[PDB]
Swiss-Prot record:
Entry comment describing in which tissues the protein is expressed: Synthesized in the acinar cells of the pancreas.
Lineage: Eukaryota, Metazoa, Chordata, Craniata, Vertebrata
Enzyme class: hydrolase
Protein residues bound to substrate: D171, S172, Q174, G175, S177
Name used for this protein in its record: Serine protease 1
Enzyme nomenclature, EC number: 3.4.21.4
Active site positions, chain numbering: H40, D84, S177
Family of the protein in this entry: Belongs to the peptidase S1 family.
Chain's gene name: PRSS1
Post-translational modification summary for this protein: Subsequent cleavage after Lys-125 leads to alpha-trypsin. Further cleavage after Lys-170 yields pseudotrypsin. A cleavage may also occur after Arg-99. Not sulfated on tyrosine residue(s).
Alphabetical list of Pfam families matching this protein: Trypsin
Location of the Peptidase S1 domain: 1-221
GO molecular function annotations of the record: endopeptidase activity; metal ion binding; serine-type endopeptidase activity; serpin family protein binding
Cofactor(s) of this protein: Ca(2+)
Co-factor: note: Binds 1 Ca(2+) ion per subunit.
Amino acid sequence: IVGGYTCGANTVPYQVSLNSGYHFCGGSLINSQWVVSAAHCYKSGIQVRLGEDNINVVEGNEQFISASKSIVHPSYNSNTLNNDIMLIKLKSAASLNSRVASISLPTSCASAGTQCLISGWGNTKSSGTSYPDVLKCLKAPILSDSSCKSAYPGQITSNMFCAGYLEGGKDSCQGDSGGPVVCSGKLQGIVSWGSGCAQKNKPGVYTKVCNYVSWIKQTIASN
Ligand SMILES: [Ca+2]
């Protein structure tokens, strides 16, 4: 997250870190057994880390649970990142508590102009590299479809939305991928892509979770 703020420990209790020997993506806990993340975060061998604040210090509220199954969306296209969504099943259910909690799936799609909370352990620099240890947060508005398409001509599908600031300075970034965009208390987006981070006229692009709720619900009823 570039241009964000330190969330505060366990104030985003649905945020997970995906670990394959190191943090590599975020995710969102949607019930005690299942995480939503980006399909481009697929790796074999994933351990889900819940209750994290500093990802490099065991502070006492973590739950580390191996994935048993990962399910990339059936129509995921890694070239365009259309349908950039994946489900991860935990080997055992998390213990839900004040620091480890699920986020609701949406009923309706969020609106342009709504301010959402984006979070993660990704790079904090637009130019260059610096990865924080503690979780970072950013409030960013959903942009109109027209603005999004103008920013990325020929690249935005109905399964994507833009959020952020066209002047630059504030955005998600590498290492935030797969993490949550929460608007009106529901999971409306997944950190997916963007041209650089926080550059002028190049807002973040996020997977439109409201289009996936029936797939998520039938998949978790079946696995
Ligand atoms: Ca920790």
